[PDB]
Short mmCIF file of C-alpha atoms and ligand atoms in Angstrom, two decimals:
data_model
loop_
_atom_site.label_atom_id
_atom_site.label_comp_id
_atom_site.label_asym_id
_atom_site.label_seq_id
_atom_site.Cartn_x
_atom_site.Cartn_y
_atom_site.Cartn_z
CA UNK A 1 -64.82 -1.01 29.22
CA UNK A 2 -67.38 -2.33 26.74
CA UNK A 3 -71.00 -1.23 26.98
CA UNK A 4 -74.39 -1.59 25.39
CA UNK A 5 -77.06 1.07 25.29
CA UNK A 6 -80.66 -0.09 25.19
CA UNK A 7 -83.15 2.27 23.61
CA UNK A 8 -86.68 2.52 25.10
CA UNK A 9 -88.83 -0.51 24.41
CA UNK A 10 -92.43 0.44 23.74
CA UNK A 11 -93.88 -3.02 24.20
CA UNK A 12 -92.78 -6.63 24.55
CA UNK A 13 -94.58 -9.57 23.00
CA UNK A 14 -93.57 -12.91 21.62
CA UNK A 15 -92.09 -16.30 22.33
CA UNK A 16 -88.66 -17.22 23.62
CA UNK A 17 -87.30 -20.78 23.46
CA UNK A 18 -85.20 -20.82 26.64
CA UNK A 19 -81.53 -21.68 26.80
CA UNK A 20 -80.95 -24.79 28.92
CA UNK A 21 -80.90 -24.60 32.70
CA UNK A 22 -77.40 -23.96 34.05
CA UNK A 23 -78.28 -25.68 37.35
CA UNK A 24 -79.48 -28.77 35.61
CA UNK A 25 -76.74 -28.74 32.95
CA UNK A 26 -73.79 -28.78 35.32
CA UNK A 27 -75.35 -31.37 37.61
CA UNK A 28 -76.14 -33.64 34.64
CA UNK A 29 -72.63 -33.30 33.21
CA UNK A 30 -70.95 -34.27 36.49
CA UNK A 31 -73.33 -37.19 37.09
CA UNK A 32 -72.94 -38.33 33.45
CA UNK A 33 -69.18 -38.23 33.90
CA UNK A 34 -69.33 -40.32 37.08
CA UNK A 35 -71.91 -42.73 35.63
CA UNK A 36 -71.57 -45.99 33.79
CA UNK A 37 -72.65 -45.84 30.17
CA UNK A 38 -73.11 -43.13 27.57
CA UNK A 39 -75.44 -40.28 28.38
CA UNK A 40 -76.86 -38.10 25.61
CA UNK A 41 -77.86 -34.70 26.98
CA UNK A 42 -80.02 -32.42 24.84
CA UNK A 43 -80.94 -28.78 25.35
CA UNK A 44 -77.68 -28.44 27.31
CA UNK A 45 -76.76 -24.83 28.02
CA UNK A 46 -73.79 -23.35 26.20
CA UNK A 47 -72.48 -20.65 28.59
CA UNK A 48 -69.29 -19.90 30.48
CA UNK A 49 -70.30 -21.97 33.51
CA UNK A 50 -70.99 -25.05 31.44
CA UNK A 51 -67.87 -24.57 29.33
CA UNK A 52 -65.75 -24.51 32.51
CA UNK A 53 -67.35 -27.77 33.66
CA UNK A 54 -66.76 -29.37 30.23
CA UNK A 55 -63.15 -28.19 30.28
CA UNK A 56 -62.67 -29.69 33.76
CA UNK A 57 -64.12 -33.00 32.61
CA UNK A 58 -61.77 -32.95 29.61
CA UNK A 59 -58.81 -32.28 31.93
CA UNK A 60 -59.90 -35.18 34.13
CA UNK A 61 -59.88 -37.54 31.18
CA UNK A 62 -63.59 -37.76 30.40
CA UNK A 63 -64.50 -38.25 26.73
CA UNK A 64 -67.46 -36.47 25.13
CA UNK A 65 -68.62 -34.86 21.91
CA UNK A 66 -70.69 -31.75 21.35
CA UNK A 67 -73.02 -30.78 18.54
CA UNK A 68 -72.40 -27.67 16.47
CA UNK A 69 -74.46 -25.46 18.77
CA UNK A 70 -73.05 -27.14 21.89
CA UNK A 71 -76.54 -28.03 23.19
CA UNK A 72 -76.27 -31.77 22.51
CA UNK A 73 -73.58 -33.66 24.37
CA UNK A 74 -72.72 -37.36 24.24
CA UNK A 75 -70.74 -38.21 27.39
CA UNK A 76 -68.81 -41.44 27.89
CA UNK A 77 -69.22 -42.12 31.59
CA UNK A 78 -66.13 -42.94 33.62
CA UNK A 79 -67.96 -45.61 35.59
CA UNK A 80 -66.83 -44.26 38.93
CA UNK A 81 -64.96 -41.39 40.69
CA UNK A 82 -62.87 -39.08 38.55
CA UNK A 83 -59.13 -38.91 39.10
CA UNK A 84 -56.01 -36.85 38.49
CA UNK A 85 -52.70 -36.26 40.28
CA UNK A 86 -49.80 -33.84 40.22
CA UNK A 87 -51.88 -31.04 41.74
CA UNK A 88 -53.60 -30.69 38.35
CA UNK A 89 -55.23 -27.26 38.32
CA UNK A 90 -58.84 -26.97 37.20
CA UNK A 91 -59.85 -23.40 36.44
CA UNK A 92 -63.56 -23.01 37.09
CA UNK A 93 -64.24 -19.39 36.16
CA UNK A 94 -67.08 -18.06 38.29
CA UNK A 95 -69.08 -21.31 38.30
CA UNK A 96 -70.41 -22.18 41.72
CA UNK A 97 -72.08 -25.25 40.25
CA UNK A 98 -68.67 -26.50 39.15
CA UNK A 99 -66.60 -25.40 42.15
CA UNK A 100 -68.82 -26.68 44.94
CA UNK A 101 -69.78 -30.03 43.36
CA UNK A 102 -66.27 -30.88 42.12
CA UNK A 103 -64.78 -29.84 45.51
CA UNK A 104 -66.74 -32.69 47.03
CA UNK A 105 -66.69 -35.22 44.22
CA UNK A 106 -62.96 -35.11 43.74
CA UNK A 107 -62.52 -36.04 47.43
CA UNK A 108 -63.42 -39.68 46.54
CA UNK A 109 -60.47 -42.06 46.63
CA UNK A 110 -57.01 -40.60 46.16
CA UNK A 111 -56.31 -37.49 44.15
CA UNK A 112 -54.12 -34.41 44.07
CA UNK A 113 -56.10 -31.68 42.35
CA UNK A 114 -56.33 -27.96 42.74
CA UNK A 115 -59.55 -26.07 42.12
CA UNK A 116 -59.38 -22.36 41.43
CA UNK A 117 -61.20 -19.74 39.40
CA UNK A 118 -61.58 -16.04 38.68
CA UNK A 119 -60.65 -13.55 41.42
CA UNK A 120 -64.24 -13.30 42.65
CA UNK A 121 -64.45 -17.09 43.04
CA UNK A 122 -61.65 -16.78 45.59
CA UNK A 123 -64.04 -14.55 47.58
CA UNK A 124 -67.08 -16.87 47.49
CA UNK A 125 -67.25 -19.03 50.63
CA UNK A 126 -66.68 -22.76 50.68
CA UNK A 127 -65.67 -23.36 54.30
CA UNK A 128 -68.93 -25.03 55.31
CA UNK A 129 -68.43 -27.63 52.58
CA UNK A 130 -64.77 -28.21 53.41
CA UNK A 131 -65.70 -28.62 57.08
CA UNK A 132 -68.22 -31.32 56.16
CA UNK A 133 -65.92 -33.13 53.72
CA UNK A 134 -63.17 -33.28 56.34
CA UNK A 135 -65.53 -34.83 58.89
CA UNK A 136 -66.03 -37.55 56.28
CA UNK A 137 -62.29 -38.06 55.96
CA UNK A 138 -61.22 -35.80 53.11
CA UNK A 139 -57.85 -34.07 53.07
CA UNK A 140 -58.32 -30.48 51.86
CA UNK A 141 -55.96 -27.54 52.00
CA UNK A 142 -56.75 -23.86 51.55
CA UNK A 143 -54.02 -22.43 49.33
CA UNK A 144 -54.91 -18.79 49.96
CA UNK A 145 -57.60 -17.47 52.31
CA UNK A 146 -59.01 -19.86 54.85
CA UNK A 147 -62.61 -20.86 54.00
CA UNK A 148 -62.31 -19.96 50.30
CA UNK A 149 -60.97 -21.40 47.03
CA UNK A 150 -58.40 -22.21 45.79
CA UNK A 151 -58.37 -25.69 47.31
CA UNK A 152 -55.89 -28.53 47.03
CA UNK A 153 -57.84 -31.82 47.24
CA UNK A 154 -55.97 -34.95 48.25
CA UNK A 155 -58.86 -37.37 48.63
CA UNK A 156 -59.97 -39.53 51.50
CA UNK A 157 -63.74 -38.96 51.82
CA UNK A 158 -65.06 -42.32 52.96
CA UNK A 159 -68.38 -41.34 54.52
CA UNK A 160 -69.71 -41.56 58.07
CA UNK A 161 -71.43 -38.96 60.23
CA UNK A 162 -71.15 -35.57 58.53
CA UNK A 163 -72.59 -32.27 59.73
CA UNK A 164 -73.01 -29.42 57.29
CA UNK A 165 -74.05 -25.80 57.75
CA UNK A 166 -76.86 -25.02 55.31
CA UNK A 167 -77.32 -21.36 56.25
CA UNK A 168 -75.12 -19.73 53.59
CA UNK A 169 -75.43 -21.87 50.45
CA UNK A 170 -77.48 -24.86 49.43
CA UNK A 171 -74.61 -25.83 47.14
CA UNK A 172 -72.59 -27.32 49.99
CA UNK A 173 -75.34 -29.85 50.75
CA UNK A 174 -75.86 -30.40 47.00
CA UNK A 175 -72.18 -31.26 46.60
CA UNK A 176 -72.30 -33.69 49.52
CA UNK A 177 -75.46 -35.38 48.29
CA UNK A 178 -74.01 -36.06 44.85
CA UNK A 179 -70.74 -37.37 46.27
CA UNK A 180 -71.80 -39.53 49.20
CA UNK A 181 -73.45 -42.38 47.25
CA UNK A 182 -70.05 -43.24 45.74
CA UNK A 183 -68.21 -43.26 49.08
CA UNK A 184 -67.40 -46.74 50.44
CA UNK A 185 -69.18 -46.21 53.77
CA UNK A 186 -72.75 -45.06 54.45
CA UNK A 187 -73.13 -41.38 55.25
CA UNK A 188 -75.56 -39.51 57.45
CA UNK A 189 -75.61 -35.80 56.54
CA UNK A 190 -76.97 -33.69 59.37
CA UNK A 191 -78.00 -30.09 58.67
CA UNK A 192 -76.79 -27.89 61.56
CA UNK A 193 -79.56 -25.32 61.51
CA UNK A 194 -81.37 -23.47 58.75
CA UNK A 195 -81.24 -24.39 55.08
CA UNK A 196 -81.37 -21.63 52.50
CA UNK A 197 -82.25 -21.96 48.81
CA UNK A 198 -84.05 -25.22 49.56
CA UNK A 199 -85.49 -25.73 46.07
CA UNK A 200 -82.02 -26.29 44.67
CA UNK A 201 -81.68 -29.36 46.87
CA UNK A 202 -84.78 -30.75 45.17
CA UNK A 203 -83.11 -30.17 41.79
CA UNK A 204 -80.09 -32.15 43.00
CA UNK A 205 -82.19 -35.05 44.28
CA UNK A 206 -84.20 -35.16 41.06
CA UNK A 207 -81.00 -35.38 39.02
CA UNK A 208 -79.49 -38.06 41.27
CA UNK A 209 -82.64 -40.17 40.91
CA UNK A 210 -82.51 -39.83 37.10
CA UNK A 211 -78.97 -41.20 37.28
CA UNK A 212 -80.06 -44.15 39.38
CA UNK A 213 -79.58 -43.06 43.00
CA UNK A 214 -82.00 -42.29 45.81
CA UNK A 215 -81.39 -41.35 49.43
CA UNK A 216 -83.45 -40.95 52.58
CA UNK A 217 -84.49 -37.34 53.13
CA UNK A 218 -85.66 -36.80 56.71
CA UNK A 219 -87.53 -33.45 56.45
CA UNK A 220 -84.36 -31.76 55.15
CA UNK A 221 -82.75 -31.95 58.60
CA UNK A 222 -80.83 -35.12 57.90
CA UNK A 223 -80.07 -37.20 54.83
CA UNK A 224 -79.20 -40.87 55.06
CA UNK A 225 -77.08 -42.12 52.21
CA UNK A 226 -76.02 -45.70 51.53
CA UNK A 227 -72.46 -45.96 50.24
CA UNK A 228 -71.07 -48.21 47.50
CA UNK A 229 -73.56 -47.06 44.87
CA UNK A 230 -73.02 -46.27 41.21
CA UNK A 231 -74.56 -43.71 38.91
CA UNK A 232 -76.06 -45.12 35.70
CA UNK A 233 -76.64 -43.42 32.36
CA UNK A 234 -80.34 -42.60 31.84
CA UNK A 235 -79.79 -42.84 28.09
CA UNK A 236 -81.11 -39.64 26.54
CA UNK A 237 -81.86 -36.80 28.91
CA UNK A 238 -83.60 -33.52 28.10
CA UNK A 239 -82.31 -30.56 30.10
CA UNK A 240 -85.13 -28.19 31.18
CA UNK A 241 -85.01 -24.62 29.87
CA UNK A 242 -83.56 -22.17 32.43
CA UNK A 243 -86.23 -20.81 34.78
CA UNK A 244 -83.89 -18.15 36.17
CA UNK A 245 -83.18 -16.89 32.63
CA UNK A 246 -86.93 -16.97 32.04
CA UNK A 247 -87.58 -14.47 34.82
CA UNK A 248 -86.34 -11.52 32.77
CA UNK A 249 -88.72 -12.15 29.90
CA UNK A 250 -91.75 -12.91 32.06
CA UNK A 251 -91.01 -9.77 34.10
CA UNK A 252 -90.69 -7.80 30.86
CA UNK A 253 -94.27 -8.74 29.93
CA UNK A 254 -95.53 -7.91 33.39
CA UNK A 255 -94.03 -4.45 32.94
CA UNK A 256 -94.61 -3.71 29.26
CA UNK A 257 -96.60 -6.47 27.55
CA UNK A 258 -98.18 -7.79 25.64
CA UNK A 259 -97.76 -11.49 26.26
CA UNK A 260 -94.41 -13.22 26.46
CA UNK A 261 -94.30 -17.00 26.35
CA UNK A 262 -91.15 -18.86 27.36
CA UNK A 263 -90.80 -22.46 26.24
CA UNK A 264 -88.76 -25.26 27.73
CA UNK A 265 -90.22 -25.04 31.23
CA UNK A 266 -93.74 -25.60 32.45
CA UNK A 267 -95.89 -26.51 35.43
CA UNK A 268 -93.98 -29.77 35.99
CA UNK A 269 -90.53 -28.17 36.11
CA UNK A 270 -88.16 -29.16 38.89
CA UNK A 271 -86.69 -25.67 39.16
CA UNK A 272 -87.77 -23.52 42.06
CA UNK A 273 -87.56 -20.38 39.98
CA UNK A 274 -90.78 -21.18 38.15
CA UNK A 275 -92.32 -19.84 41.37
CA UNK A 276 -91.15 -16.41 40.20
CA UNK A 277 -94.30 -16.50 38.07
CA UNK A 278 -96.36 -16.66 41.27
CA UNK A 279 -94.76 -13.41 42.40
CA UNK A 280 -95.63 -11.65 39.14
CA UNK A 281 -99.19 -12.87 39.60
CA UNK A 282 -99.26 -11.49 43.16
CA UNK A 283 -98.12 -8.17 41.69
CA UNK A 284 -100.97 -8.04 39.19
CA UNK A 285 -99.75 -9.82 36.09
CA UNK A 286 -101.61 -12.69 34.42
CA UNK A 287 -99.83 -16.06 34.15
CA UNK A 288 -100.65 -19.02 31.89
CA UNK A 289 -99.18 -22.45 32.44
CA UNK A 290 -98.55 -25.20 29.95
CA UNK A 291 -96.75 -28.49 29.95
CA UNK A 292 -93.83 -26.90 28.15
CA UNK A 293 -94.39 -23.18 28.51
CA UNK A 294 -95.14 -20.41 30.97
CA UNK A 295 -96.51 -17.13 29.67
CA UNK A 296 -97.08 -13.74 31.26
CA UNK A 297 -99.49 -11.07 30.15
CA UNK A 298 -99.49 -7.49 31.32
CA UNK A 299 -102.11 -6.67 33.92
CA UNK A 300 -100.96 -4.16 36.49
CA UNK A 301 -98.01 -3.99 38.84
CA UNK A 302 -98.29 -3.45 42.57
CA UNK A 303 -95.55 -3.53 45.18
CA UNK A 304 -95.11 -6.62 47.34
CA UNK A 305 -93.39 -7.45 50.64
CA UNK A 306 -92.19 -11.05 50.57
CA UNK A 307 -89.61 -13.51 51.91
CA UNK A 308 -87.68 -14.51 48.77
CA UNK A 309 -85.35 -17.15 50.18
CA UNK A 310 -86.89 -19.80 47.94
CA UNK A 311 -86.06 -17.86 44.74
CA UNK A 312 -82.91 -15.87 45.55
CA UNK A 313 -81.74 -15.33 41.95
CA UNK A 314 -85.07 -14.66 40.30
CA UNK A 315 -85.80 -12.32 43.21
CA UNK A 316 -83.26 -9.90 41.76
CA UNK A 317 -85.55 -9.53 38.74
CA UNK A 318 -88.32 -8.41 41.08
CA UNK A 319 -85.99 -5.70 42.43
CA UNK A 320 -85.77 -3.94 39.05
CA UNK A 321 -89.39 -4.77 38.15
CA UNK A 322 -90.24 -2.94 41.38
CA UNK A 323 -89.21 0.28 39.59
CA UNK A 324 -92.46 -0.04 37.67
CA UNK A 325 -94.73 -1.07 40.49
CA UNK A 326 -97.12 1.05 42.50
CA UNK A 327 -95.83 1.37 46.05
CA UNK A 328 -92.76 0.26 47.99
CA UNK A 329 -91.45 -3.25 47.42
CA UNK A 330 -89.57 -5.16 50.13
CA UNK A 331 -87.67 -8.40 49.45
CA UNK A 332 -86.63 -10.24 52.61
CA UNK A 333 -84.45 -13.09 53.79
CA UNK A 334 -81.94 -12.72 51.01
CA UNK A 335 -78.70 -12.45 52.92
CA UNK A 336 -76.74 -14.70 50.57
CA UNK A 337 -77.14 -12.19 47.80
CA UNK A 338 -74.02 -10.82 49.54
CA UNK A 339 -71.81 -13.83 48.85
CA UNK A 340 -72.33 -14.51 45.16
CA UNK A 341 -70.88 -12.98 41.92
CA UNK A 342 -70.79 -9.70 43.82
CA UNK A 343 -72.44 -8.48 47.00
CA UNK A 344 -75.79 -8.17 45.25
CA UNK A 345 -77.54 -6.26 48.01
CA UNK A 346 -74.92 -3.50 47.80
CA UNK A 347 -74.81 -3.62 43.99
CA UNK A 348 -78.58 -3.69 43.48
CA UNK A 349 -79.17 -0.82 45.89
CA UNK A 350 -76.38 1.26 44.35
CA UNK A 351 -77.54 0.82 40.77
CA UNK A 352 -81.26 1.21 41.56
CA UNK A 353 -80.54 4.59 43.14
CA UNK A 354 -78.74 5.70 39.99
CA UNK A 355 -81.95 5.45 37.96
CA UNK A 356 -83.92 7.34 40.61
CA UNK A 357 -85.22 4.95 43.23
CA UNK A 358 -85.07 5.52 46.98
CA UNK A 359 -83.58 2.34 48.41
CA UNK A 360 -82.98 1.00 51.89
CA UNK A 361 -80.18 -1.58 51.79
CA UNK A 362 -81.00 -3.79 54.76
CA UNK A 363 -78.61 -6.38 56.07
CA UNK A 364 -80.62 -9.21 54.50
CA UNK A 365 -83.44 -7.39 52.71
CA UNK A 366 -83.96 -4.51 50.32
CA UNK A 367 -86.74 -1.91 50.28
CA UNK A 368 -87.39 -0.09 47.02
CA UNK A 369 -89.51 3.01 46.46
CA UNK A 370 -89.77 3.82 42.74
CA UNK A 371 -89.31 7.35 41.43
CA UNK A 372 -92.14 9.12 39.62
CA UNK A 373 -89.99 8.81 36.49
CA UNK A 374 -86.74 7.01 35.78
CA UNK A 375 -83.61 8.79 34.65
CA UNK A 376 -80.71 7.67 32.52
CA UNK A 377 -77.81 5.84 34.11
CA UNK A 378 -74.75 3.94 33.05
CA UNK A 379 -75.17 0.73 35.05
CA UNK A 380 -72.17 -0.96 36.64
CA UNK A 381 -72.53 -4.72 36.47
CA UNK A 382 -69.93 -6.04 38.94
CA UNK A 383 -68.93 -9.00 36.72
CA UNK A 384 -72.39 -10.34 37.52
CA UNK A 385 -74.58 -11.71 34.75
CA UNK A 386 -77.72 -11.03 36.74
CA UNK A 387 -76.97 -7.34 37.29
CA UNK A 388 -76.78 -6.87 33.52
CA UNK A 389 -79.96 -8.80 32.86
CA UNK A 390 -81.93 -7.21 35.69
CA UNK A 391 -81.05 -3.69 34.65
CA UNK A 392 -81.88 -4.34 31.03
CA UNK A 393 -85.51 -3.97 32.22
CA UNK A 394 -84.94 -0.25 32.86
CA UNK A 395 -85.38 0.25 29.10
CA UNK A 396 -89.06 -0.81 29.38
CA UNK A 397 -89.70 2.87 30.05
CA UNK A 398 -89.23 6.30 28.50
CA UNK A 399 -85.48 6.31 29.14
CA UNK A 400 -82.60 4.48 27.55
CA UNK A 401 -80.10 2.72 29.83
CA UNK A 402 -76.44 1.88 29.25
CA UNK A 403 -75.23 -1.47 30.58
CA UNK A 404 -71.50 -1.79 31.24
CA UNK A 405 -69.75 -5.06 30.32
CA UNK A 406 -72.84 -6.63 28.70
CA UNK A 407 -70.89 -9.79 27.86
CA UNK A 408 -70.91 -10.75 31.52
CA UNK A 409 -74.32 -12.26 30.78
CA UNK A 410 -72.41 -15.12 29.12
CA UNK A 411 -71.98 -16.79 32.50
CA UNK A 412 -75.46 -18.25 31.92
CA UNK A 413 -76.97 -16.57 28.87
CA UNK A 414 -74.65 -15.48 26.04
CA UNK A 415 -77.55 -14.52 23.74
CA UNK A 416 -79.49 -12.56 26.34
CA UNK A 417 -79.67 -9.22 24.57
CA UNK A 418 -80.55 -10.72 21.19
CA UNK A 419 -83.39 -12.63 22.90
CA UNK A 420 -84.65 -9.50 24.71
CA UNK A 421 -84.56 -7.70 21.36
CA UNK A 422 -86.55 -10.53 19.81
CA UNK A 423 -89.56 -9.71 21.99
CA UNK A 424 -88.96 -5.92 21.92
CA UNK A 425 -91.53 -4.17 19.70
CA UNK A 426 -91.71 -0.58 18.57
CA UNK A 427 -95.47 -0.66 18.24
C1 SC1 B 1 -74.95 -17.78 42.28
C2 SC1 B 1 -75.30 -18.63 40.96
O1 SC1 B 1 -76.49 -19.52 41.00
C3 SC1 B 1 -76.70 -20.42 42.10
C4 SC1 B 1 -76.95 -21.88 41.52
C5 SC1 B 1 -77.52 -22.90 42.51
C6 SC1 B 1 -77.49 -24.34 42.14
O2 SC1 B 1 -77.34 -25.17 43.02
O3 SC1 B 1 -77.64 -24.59 40.97
C7 SC1 B 1 -78.08 -22.50 43.76
C8 SC1 B 1 -78.12 -21.04 44.15
O4 SC1 B 1 -76.98 -20.77 45.24
P1 SC1 B 1 -77.20 -20.72 46.91
O5 SC1 B 1 -78.32 -19.62 47.12
O6 SC1 B 1 -77.63 -22.14 47.32
O7 SC1 B 1 -75.77 -20.38 47.35
C9 SC1 B 1 -78.00 -20.05 42.87
O8 SC1 B 1 -78.00 -18.73 43.43
C10 SC1 B 1 -75.39 -17.76 39.71
O9 SC1 B 1 -75.87 -18.23 38.62
O10 SC1 B 1 -75.10 -16.55 39.92
P2 SC1 B 1 -73.78 -19.77 40.93
O11 SC1 B 1 -74.05 -20.90 39.96
O12 SC1 B 1 -72.59 -18.93 40.38
O13 SC1 B 1 -73.45 -20.24 42.38
#
């Protein structure tokens, strides 16, 4: 069991050029692969999740080249649905943005492909997506547990009236939206009830439009898609910096700055996590917005009680930042924290208590009362990149913290600790 011990950080200040957005990167790679023409992506993220997508595209026959730092990618579009037979197995690690979108996209036409991944991926739900794809004609078989990967996809999605449950993951609707335009028949996607993580749907629609496709969004309750479309290369495309990755550094300044500026995202960003900055501001930090940067300057830090459904991932950063706030913080409407890399409500509560906090683990919320002073703990990270990055903030105090399996940050941010060190100052 590898580990990293962070010594106390007296102050943070500086500028971080953000790694590319994982959400945008994997969507752009899949659309570029399906599109006609050559797409040149820049500021692409090099992380495990993107590498698994690139490996899947390679296995499917897509041609592409990567620059030395793997942030520039020239993709030769396939000019239509991707194909493979012989129950070709695509190993997708822990990448939800590869598993959910490919589960739908590979249902176009005929195919015989198996999607699988790390053990935890076999415990992340996908039944709502499979249910929807089958209504549209796809043949899908669960090879292990019903409602979870691995899946054997044998094609057949032609379109039509499709209902989809949007209460557990926005990724199921995202997958359907990207796939439907290429189906031969028109599709009407009806959302059964609630829709969580709504901002991610906006990311998907923004990407689809860049690649030449638009659909009719009826107040997010129903989406009308015309079939027989084709994605088209947008030429050169700049991937936004990752707003979720940015949360750690902006939070660090709110706790111990100084001023930390993150570049690559700004007021015009399509990512919902830029709204994390609004939460820091509500807590007492100062935020500055630019066209290509967001910065945070230390002010004060007061507890908040907020519904965080719109920023589920960045919300985790508020849970550890809460250790430094005055009062009890409550984060609500975050049930799906339980069905991701790990059950994050259980993990976050468990690890927060280890450093001294009093924590109520609610079914779909978490209440955190900070201790007068933090204590040392060896933090378990549950194979979850965000647990490692969130708990790195514990070192913005008088106590060191040891993070187990620090390399798990590579899912989305291989250079995380070097970047945190870059803004860490002794004086
Ligand atoms: C969980 C994850 O990030 C997810 C990425 C994502 C997207 O569409 O890009 C939407 C959200 O899932 P949901 O709330 O709609 O289910 C994020 O939490 C991560 O980075 O941990 P993953 O990409 O593994 O699903």
